[PDB]
């Protein structure tokens, strides 16, 4: 079976919450590839691109992170928390 | 005839890339049946629950699913894929 980008988000927000990361990337990562795919939703790229980055960085992947970081910006130049998260991700792969 | 557990762990491993999950359920089972006989063998259960519990899955029996999926983080609480399968279950079965 397979899961929309609606119910793979809720999915990967959940573990989100709690804080469990590896599952949100794997939830994360469905709801980003059925939105690829052409899925029609509600849910948007840079939303599922904020968790995914996010999670991949909290297990140790900062090149993962910053990569789809990027991602995010090319999408949502003047995005908030993926600008700072930009700027952090730099910072620690440059020590 | 039988098989081992490791002889029927491989037969429905095979059958599990291949994905014929029938045949993988099938063979776990006598996998399993052979543990819990007391068989001496380099398998182990939460191993072969894992596998069960997804080819059940397949097959569209949740019940039976979430039930093996249970019984596998009663013997390896910390079971990474495991503990995604029971919140991924009970989010199908809501639903």
Redesign the interface.
Known sequence: ?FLTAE?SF??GK??YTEA?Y??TE?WMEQALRQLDEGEISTIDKVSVLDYLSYAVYQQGDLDKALLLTKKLLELDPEHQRANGNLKYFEYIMAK
Do not use: S
Request: charged share 30%.
């Open positions: 079976m119910d809720e999915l959940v573990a469990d590896y599952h794997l």
